[PDB]
Amino acid sequence: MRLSYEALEWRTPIENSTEPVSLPPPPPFFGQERAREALELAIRGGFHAYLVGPPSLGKHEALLAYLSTQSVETPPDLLYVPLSERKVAVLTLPSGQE
């Protein structure tokens, strides 16, 4: 069938283009609700997750942005303390006490 221009036209029309745009930043993993929900489940449950996607997509940057806005109970101060000149163990202290 001989396609017409209207059926072939795909660029969204522009009614005004001389003004700057002011839009709020989008939520991380925008348009990718599957991965966002996977990260939400892995964060709530504490499970180990893994990110899969095509190369050069922004997975690392988006994941870092999403993890930055997260909030968790402050981790305890973990540090090595020597029981002797040969024996050293792991010490757990409340955050800020180290």
Binding site: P24, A42, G53
Partner: protein, 426 residues
């Protein structure tokens, strides 16, 4: 004790550790890391030169390690049964995003937060270019770094502001920076070195569309020709039986053979042999593109049917005759349009493409403008019969039909073959 250096595990305690699967497997540390995750404890790596070494207590692991990378890095590790239960959660990133006004607004906000200054038209053109980069009309490309790079080029060409003109210039420059091969091809076509019939009609030949393997984003027509000779049923694709045809191309010749057999049975077999070959050698086949092109060329050769040479033909075909979709349809259409424009549009040039690829048609501004002006004609087909009807400009059924012409040609070839065998047993 003070010489113990903190690694990734120590600094990620109580939080999230982000690792790359390909780099993790490249260093061969997967086994030790997996054992540490299994035990929940780990010790710092010690040199083999230690006389006695410190009695380091294993460090408890309270983190949530996240592996980020391409899937191909993960089929290098998913076979391990211990990897399955450690990573119960799989986060898969879609290669595309839904092309919606909300998604366009989100992309604009992301670009503004990235540091670029955009306009409404510039954002619209970025959205359109992302959709085209995803190759689908209603799905934008999810590769945000590619769009960011294009936005950077647009900012440079526009002084920082991402107006529609600036982004259009950026896209044009990106196309032109890799245009040398296509420029040489167009020069050869204009000079007559590579002769392509983009006007008039010819028998047994059609302008098949190919995409160059050296750069799988530039399309160009390839003058495929088919010649029908009486003999055994075996179909010859001369460009394959020279070391060029691939495993995917192996299925193509059997597919056309099966369709030609099952569709035309008034003798026990096909009384013809078909010789398929492109005019040039830059068409080393990897994939089922052309397809429909080879089928219509072979049918025209069988029936002595002058195919309209101004219409290029692409798209894979099955043994049922249904035309299947092919990739990089936009590249093929744009390449054929470029070739036709180089020789001058006559108002009748066009491309025969499957209706399945209609959802992948994201043609550039010039092609759509030519279609609107009537200088170019995009045709969408479902079965090979429609494509051959368009090429020959007449109906299959009825008198003066294409099917009856092909049947008469096959009958004449069978008569000549039986005359040969008559002389054989005389």
């Amino acid at each position: 004790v003070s010489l113990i250096r903190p690694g990734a595990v120590h600094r990620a305690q109580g939080g999230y550790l982000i690792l790359d699967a390909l780099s993790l497997k490249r260093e061969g540390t997967w086994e030790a890391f997996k054992r540490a995750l299994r035990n929940g404890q780990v010790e710092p790596v010690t040199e083999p030169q230690a006389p006695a070494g410190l009695e380091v207590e294993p460090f408890p692991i309270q983190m949530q390690v996240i592996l980020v990378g391409t899937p191909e890095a993960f089929e290098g590790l998913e076979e391990d049964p211990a990897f399955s239960e450690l990573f119960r959660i799989r986060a898969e990133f879609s290669p595309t995003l839904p092309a919606s006004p909300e998604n366009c607004t989100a992309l604009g906000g992301w670009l503004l937060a990235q540091g670029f200054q955009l306009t409404q038209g510039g954002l619209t053109r970025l959205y359109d270019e992302a959709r085209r980069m995803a190759e689908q009309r209603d799905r934008m490309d999810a590769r945000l770094v590619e769009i960011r790079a294009l936005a950077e080029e647009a900012a440079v060409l526009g002084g920082g502001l991402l107006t529609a003109e600036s982004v259009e210039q950026a896209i044009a420059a990106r196309e032109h920076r890799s245009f040398l091969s296509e420029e040489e091809f167009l020069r050869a076509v204009q000079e007559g070195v590579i002769r392509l019939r983009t006007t008039g009609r010819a028998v047994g030949e059609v302008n098949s569309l190919v995409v160059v393997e050296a750069a799988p984003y530039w399309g160009r027509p390839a003058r495929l020709t088919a010649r029908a000779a009486p003999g055994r049923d075996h179909l010859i694709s001369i460009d394959r039986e020279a070391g060029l045809g691939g495993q995917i191309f192996h299925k193509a010749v059997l597919t056309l053979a099966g369709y030609l057999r099952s569709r035309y049975i008034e003798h026990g077999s096909l009384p013809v042999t078909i010789s398929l070959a492109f005019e040039q050698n830059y068409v080393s086949i990897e994939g089922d593109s052309a397809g429909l092109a080879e089928l219509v060329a072979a049918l025209s050769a069988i029936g002595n049917l002058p195919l309209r040479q101004d219409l290029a033909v692409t798209g894979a075909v099955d043994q049922t005759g249904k035309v299947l979709a092919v990739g990089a349809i936009n590249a093929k259409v744009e390449g054929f349009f470029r070739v036709c424009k180089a020789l001058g549009l006559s108002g009748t040039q066009g491309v025969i493409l499957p209706e399945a690829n209609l959802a992948n048609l994201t043609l550039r501004a010039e092609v759509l403008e030519a279609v609107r002006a009537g200088q170019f004609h995009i045709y969408a087909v479902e079965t090979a019969e429609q494509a051959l009807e368009i090429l020959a400009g007449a109906r299959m059924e009825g008198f003066r039909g294409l099917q009856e012409k092909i049947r008469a040609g096959l009958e004449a070839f069978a008569r000549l073959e039986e005359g040969h065998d008559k002389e054989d047993r005389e």
